Amino acid sequence: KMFSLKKWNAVAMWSWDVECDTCAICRVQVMDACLRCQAENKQEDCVVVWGECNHSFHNCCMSLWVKQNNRCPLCQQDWVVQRIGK
Amino acid sequence: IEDYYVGVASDVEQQGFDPEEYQFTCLTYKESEGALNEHMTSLASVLKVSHSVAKLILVNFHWQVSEILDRYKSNSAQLLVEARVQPNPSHPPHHCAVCMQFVRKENLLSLACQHQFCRSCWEQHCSVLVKDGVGVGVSCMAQDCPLRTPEDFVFPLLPNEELREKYRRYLFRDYVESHYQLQLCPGADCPMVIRVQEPRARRVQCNRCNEVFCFKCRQMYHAPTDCATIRKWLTKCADNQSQQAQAREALKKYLFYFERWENHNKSLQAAAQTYQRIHEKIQERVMNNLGTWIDWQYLQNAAKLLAKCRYTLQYTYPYAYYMESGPRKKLFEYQQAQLEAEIANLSWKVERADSYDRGDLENQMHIAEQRRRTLLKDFH
Amino acid sequence: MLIKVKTLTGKEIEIDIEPTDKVERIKERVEEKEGIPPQQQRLIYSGKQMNDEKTAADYKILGGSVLHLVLALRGG
Amino acid sequence: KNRLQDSAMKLVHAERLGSQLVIGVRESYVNLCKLQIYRDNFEKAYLDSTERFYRTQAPSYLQQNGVQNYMKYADAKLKEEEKRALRYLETRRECNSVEALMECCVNALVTSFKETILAECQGMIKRNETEKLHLMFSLMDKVPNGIEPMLKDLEEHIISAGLADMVAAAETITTDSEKYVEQLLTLFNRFSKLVKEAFQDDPRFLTARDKAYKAVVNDATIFKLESKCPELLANYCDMLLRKTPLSKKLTSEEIEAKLKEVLLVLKYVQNKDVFMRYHKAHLTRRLILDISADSEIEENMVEWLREVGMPADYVNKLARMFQDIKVSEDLNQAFKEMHKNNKLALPADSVNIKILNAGAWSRSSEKVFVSLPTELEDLIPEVEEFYKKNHSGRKLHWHHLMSNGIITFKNEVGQYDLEVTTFQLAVLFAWNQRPREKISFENLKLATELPDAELRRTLWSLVAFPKLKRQVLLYEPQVNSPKDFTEGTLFSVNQEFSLVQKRGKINLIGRLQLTTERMREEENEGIVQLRILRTQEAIIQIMKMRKKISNAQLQTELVEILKNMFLPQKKMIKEQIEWLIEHKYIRRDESDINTFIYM
Ligand SMILES: [Zn+2]
Ligand SMILES: [Zn+2]
Ligand SMILES: [Zn+2]
Ligand SMILES: [Zn+2]
Ligand SMILES: [Zn+2]
Ligand SMILES: [Zn+2]
Ligand SMILES: [Zn+2]
């Protein structure tokens, strides 16, 4: 048949399957990396954690917050890690 | 290789900030008067009324033409009553009620209230009021009467030119004050007026005397707070358990914020010496044969950024002191502490440092600016 | 006003109308051109089925616009 | 004591015009009294004699021989007076007599006539008077606070000359990026050589040169009024870095030197963010097409950009892009190794994938409507589920503007192959059926689901390629603007298109688009509704024609029936089958549920 395909180069873009698209601690969009990681150049090691209250944050920011106190900064409920991004 | 780069100026623009952004138009002393005259002419033509009553309408309604038209269409009778033009709806005396002396009919002037008084008393009252700095506040002598004397009535009662000129100056000042888009410069005899589309509480700078002040209230630029909290905070700074223990705890909490307020105030007030020191530390680097003048230029930008970030911090502490204790206050204070730490880091890297690397310093600048924007974003 | 109406097979029918023409009269133009009855005629423009009571200009049809003619399902 | 010092001046007066006798007297008064008496008498008289003599003499020479010779005379007189001071004055006993006399002499011979020399300074900056400019700079440096007018005049001359040259040469400079960079480099080199020759690279003059060049580069006279300099610089960088013919002949070291010169110029621009945006777009195109001349040069380029002082955001973004390129290079090999066995219609050796971050690269959660072929719709779910294996909590937004590929074209003359984007791919696939047939501009808008503007641009790029003489698609109502396409325009495939080589390869992707308009949802919804109605009508018609037909023949007969309207999709076919079986239009066979019955 006329106009058959020989070679293709697909391109796709990935993003975190989250909501509100904002860490709400540093107010940086989730698809990016946190400021400290971005400055220190340790990229791809900055991930997203979820919670039983259905709130998403950076792993680094949430680690600092739990080092401060154990409660979600958005809803005043005890922080229980539901799942980790990767 | 030549037709390739034709339409690159549009494709690259995949996506285009400044949370405190503002468009102030700069007007001189006469341009403002011209604008006032134009507005008064338009209103007088529209409502088929004289100039003085149109000015009274504009003053009473803050020079908002649309609201004036809407209220005129709704009910014209109450519009003039509220603007103190005509008395509320709900034969010559030949005897002044304030000097008790019989006078001729022609010398017995009166307003729409039909409160008649002799011409000499009118002149005395207008003279004393204009001497007392009273502008649009001239009203009828009769007690409880809210009616005000229009411009075409006051002027013939002013004998000399200096009283007329003072009356004009006070009228202009009151017109600028009552206008919802014009504000006088709070400077020392600065003859300037700032004009803007809509009134808000943002940063304005008079280009003539380089004064920065809040628009809605002619005070220093309080960035995150409002015009009421900062007033009471400045007023205060000048002068289970028992109540006394609560008082001690309140004093401790007040000190916990006042110490940081004073720290940042003094640090900002001592910035000229920092600028001079950085200039000298650049001169010492450039006279010796290493680099040129263009290489050591980012240190001035660093100093400006630190000054801006310190100014932003200084005004967030009264904001956080007058807040309801909940989930929001803790996050705000956490972000505030983060920004404080990063300012300390950058200040150490700029002032008390020997070897300057541009990549690290630029990263610090970006982080500090992002944190300042994050702190200011939530409210504005 | 000279518009264009499309069928399934790809055959094209050309008709001339007026801006004030009611779309029904467009249907009877279709029948004086082709032998398909009005009850089996569904006319669709821009993905929208036209109701019987309407003027052509009310559907924002222009000169060289193309109309789509879809048969009624149970009627055919 | 006064008698001897008085007669010394008479001897000095003779020597000024044209030793031990004075030295012995100096020593006698130095040690007679510890230098206070020498600081009172003797020293003052010597300074007074020098001042009187030179105030009487120097102006006469000035009006005799002019400033050009007067400067040389002043230099010679200063040297002679310094030698006389060192030979006739106490200096070895820690005495400031030499410094005081030098101060008096310079004040009497330079400060007294500085304006007359500074006027000549303003005069002689041009026409290359360096040989006397050096002498003047030597003269004026001794006087405190004397060289600032020289700096001001040099800055003004540099600014004026640069602006005048830019305006005079603005014909071939505004539209060309090579000439702009060449002119900037020539100006910088000329003025740097001038400074080095005239003032032996004094730091103050270097500062003045930098401050003047900063204003020169940032000039609003390019569009006879905006900021276009960063765009031209980025275009030059792209030419140096891309696989253009200009960089084909140059060597790596020469390219690196040219880049270093470009970055040296780049240190003076004011809005570096615009340049970073343009460079990021160019690098995106280069990385996606894989047409880089040298990758290590690009990595050193981003390192140098970080060193120069670019904003910290775009540099980190570029580093992230390079890291993502490496990660995707690994991922593609992993996917190919997985897919090597279960061969599909597309062999695993001719398919590439690139999963990239959505923050560093284009950030847009926009929807693009394209009717993809069957070979591409059977590949998205496979890649999606493969990515959902090792990674959790991650989405995938497929990019259709950046995707590209190679197809082959079969004429009656010969077989070729092309390099096309997804949009041109969808437009070209409309001719798979109805090969030698005309298609209107409106049937295309339905068969490809593309919006009006994108369809117009793609069709214009497909029928009006600049370099080529022969083309693939031709249309009858010829026009010189894509905006004048009418709904009655007819397109057809050029059966006589050729390169007369029977085989060859040409490129149709020139600057793949990185941005499109907001495709309105109303038009796509209307197209979808019309497609649903048409496929329902076709299915019911074929059921009416034959009341008993299996499922396998259904798709073939539907393709044959729907060939002049559009190509039906399997998903929509199944959905419409369900929607019609639910409304009793057709009936499902009881024995084996694959055949349908009409009633
Ligand atoms: Zn975060
Ligand atoms: Zn991180
Ligand atoms: Zn929560
Ligand atoms: Zn009286
Ligand atoms: Zn009254
Ligand atoms: Zn001012
Ligand atoms: Zn205020």
Residue numbers in the entry:
A (entry chain R): 28 to 113
B (entry chain H): 35 to 50, 54 to 127, 134 to 282, 351 to 491
C (entry chain N): 1 to 76
D (entry chain C): 152 to 169, 174 to 188, 194 to 385, 401 to 674, 680 to 779
Quote the study's own text.
The E3 ARIH2 has been implicated in ubiquitylation of substrates of neddylated CUL5-RBX2-based E3s, including APOBEC3-family substrates of the host E3 hijacked by HIV-1 virion infectivity factor (Vif). Structures of ARIH2 alone and bound to neddylated CRL5Vif-CBFβ reveal the HIV-1 hijacked E3-E3 ligase assembly that overcomes host restriction and defines mechanisms by which NEDD8-linked CUL5-RBX2 activates ARIH2.
We obtained cryo-EM maps for two ARIH2* complexes with neddylated CRL5Vif-CBFβ, one with the substrate APOBEC3C and the other with APOBEC3G (hereafter A3C and A3G, respectively). ARIH2 catalytic Cys thiol is shown as a yellow sphere. c, Color-coded schematics of subunits and domains of neddylated CRL5Vif-CBFβ and APOBEC3C (A3C). d, Model of ARIH2* (full-length ARIH2 with L381A, E382A and E455A residue substitutions) complex with neddylated CRL5Vif-CBFβ and A3C in cryo-EM reconstruction low-pass filtered to 7.5 Å. Coordinates for ARIH2*, RBX2 and a portion of neddylated CUL5 (CR3 domain through the C terminus) were built into the map shown in Extended Data Fig. 2b. CUL5-linked NEDD8 does not approach ARIH2*. NEDD8 also binds the edge of CUL5 in the intermolecular C/R domain. One interaction involves ARIH2*’s Ariadne domain binding CUL5 and RBX2 in an E3-E3act superdomain. Here the loop between the first and second helices of ARIH2*’s Ariadne domain docks in a cleft from CUL5’s CR3 and 4HB domains. The third and fourth helices, on other side of ARIH2*’s Ariadne domain, bind RBX2’s RING domain and the junction with CUL5.
